[PDB]
């Protein structure tokens, strides 16, 4: 296959499957080798931590561990990842990554790769007056209760509500009105973060969900752009098997974005068949199914996914690492 495993070490759900998706994010992951960590401490350092498992994914010929990664950030009792979801994770490893790459030359690749631009805005009907604040997001919640597919979940995503009745908006100087709120996308990032919300207050739906190989986008944007539509590529699937309580959590990617897909579990990565990675993981009447999908926006591929060599790595990086092997295999 060419890529090697995590290792299965309890029940962090959809860590592993979250920590491949980074790791074949190329571009993410020459900037984590870049952060500041020569003077850090293993027992406290989320993002040495996990410039250990990439390195390790990237090197290793066994299936790499990541106890120094729960170590780091905290979660490290029974259940400290059933009462969580992958969006949380993302968040606070990708914030964690972050407020460490500020100040630092590779300061800001996160919002290039993962913000977009949203409206959201209040219009009042009988009286003139509206509120447009813009919102950046990092991913996107997309229900999926009643709907087929994805294009239906933005549909719902950006439809208007209503407020009305003991409802209605406060106005200010205008009091009480009646008045019509949503969201308009503004921009799109090159990586796509959709979580499929599944997993709700707390049960799971398996209901059968389509998405496809390619997500065109344009018709959800306020403003469109010639020479960059929002064409999109799917490029990770996030499965989980089962009901609410328990489960196996596994990953399909194509890490190239070349339709080569192979299934991640944990320590075993095998082929498969794009029927496997795609529609197989619609769910509906069993109960394996999608939570999360990653998508690269068609004209940033090629960037997103450039490739990554022993050379991205600094040396300073690479010594501190092979010292700690060392030392373990005594």
Known sequence: TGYVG???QGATCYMNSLLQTLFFTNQLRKAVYMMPTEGDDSSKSVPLALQRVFYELQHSDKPVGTKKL???FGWETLDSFMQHDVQELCRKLLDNVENKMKGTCVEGTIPKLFRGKMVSYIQCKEVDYRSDRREDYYDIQLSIKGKKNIFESFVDYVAVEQLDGDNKYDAGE???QEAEKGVKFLTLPPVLHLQLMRFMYNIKINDRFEFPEQ???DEFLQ??????PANYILHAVLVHSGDNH???????????????????DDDVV???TKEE???HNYGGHHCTNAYMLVYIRESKLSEVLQAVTDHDIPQQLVERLQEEKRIEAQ
């Open 6 to 8: 995590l290792k299965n």
């Open 70 to 72: 729960t170590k780091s």
């Open 174 to 176: 205008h009091g009480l």
């Open 215 to 217: 997500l065109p986008l």
């Open 223 to 228: 403003k469109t752009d010639p020479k960059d």
């Open 246 to 264: 328990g489960g196996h959590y596994v990953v399909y990617l194509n890490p190239k974005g070349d339709g080569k897909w192979c299934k991640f």
């Open 270 to 272: 095998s082929r498969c």
């Open 277 to 279: 990675a795609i529609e």
